[PDB]
Amino acid sequence: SVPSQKTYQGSYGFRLGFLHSGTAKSVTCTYSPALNKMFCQLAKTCPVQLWVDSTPPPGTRVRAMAIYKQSQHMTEVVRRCPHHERCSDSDGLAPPQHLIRVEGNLRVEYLDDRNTFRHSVVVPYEPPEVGSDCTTIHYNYMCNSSCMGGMNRRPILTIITLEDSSGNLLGRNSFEVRVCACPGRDRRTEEEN
């Protein structure tokens, strides 16, 4: 029973935003609005903005989970390849198997689901900082889309769910992700289609 990817703004008007970073040679993470697709480098900072019409209560949580986009691969759990799992890159909080990490958050929590065996990373919701109208989470993707014995060129979605302290669903959104050496070049190439 593949986890739901259906968009749901729900009670708090929950949407995702991304920086308008462009496709310049130097860019480590870039979002294509035309493709609803993030292009990012391995282990590099991937800002995802949370936008709400109304402030969820304290103890609201934000979960990230990867699934395969293709229907024939969707029941397979998205995990790191053997090679990246054994690279000495653990930050002491993230399980070595987990594709998606959060950086800069000491309250981050990781789940190996007892029944689905799917991986996810959860942080407390904090309201926007002074200056901002959105909340930024810094994701790291710890395997390349190309990795043999991992994703192996199969496209993935990230599903961002907003939940209350009791685990009740408040909101859900999703975006395609490609983890690659040259996000700028790969975004430009994929858009020319």
Start-to-end CA span in the chain (Å): 33
CB 62 within 8 A of CB 162: yes
Query: Was 40 annotated as part of a binding site?
Result: no
With respect to Zn ion, which residue has the nearer C-beta, 104 or 149? 149
Query: Was 46 annotated as part of a binding site?
Result: no
Hey, which residues does 159 pair with through a beta bridge? 65, 174
Is residue 42 within the footprint of ligand A1LU0 (CB under 6 A)?
yes
127 binds, among ligand A1LU0, a second copy, Zn ion, none (CB under 5 to 8 A by kind): none
Choose, by CB under 6 A, the member of 13, 57, 82, 149 that binds ligand A1LU0.
57
Choose, by CB under 8 A, the member of 1, 71, 88, 115 that binds a second copy.
88
Whole-number Cα distances in Å, 178 to 123, 156, 157: 23, 7, 9
Query: Was 87 annotated as part of a binding site?
Result: no
Q: Which of residues 36-65 bind a second copy (CB under 8 A)?
A: 42, 53-54, 57-59
Beta pairing, strands 29-32 & 46-51: unpaired
Nearest alpha carbon to residue 78 among 22, 154, 137: 154
3-state secondary structure of 85: helix
Choose, by CB under 8 A, the member of 2, 22, 70, 76 that binds a second copy.
22
Choose, by CB under 8 A, the member of 5, 7, 11, 116 that binds a second copy.
11
Q: Which residues are annotated as a binding site for Zn(2+)?
A: 81, 84, 143, 147
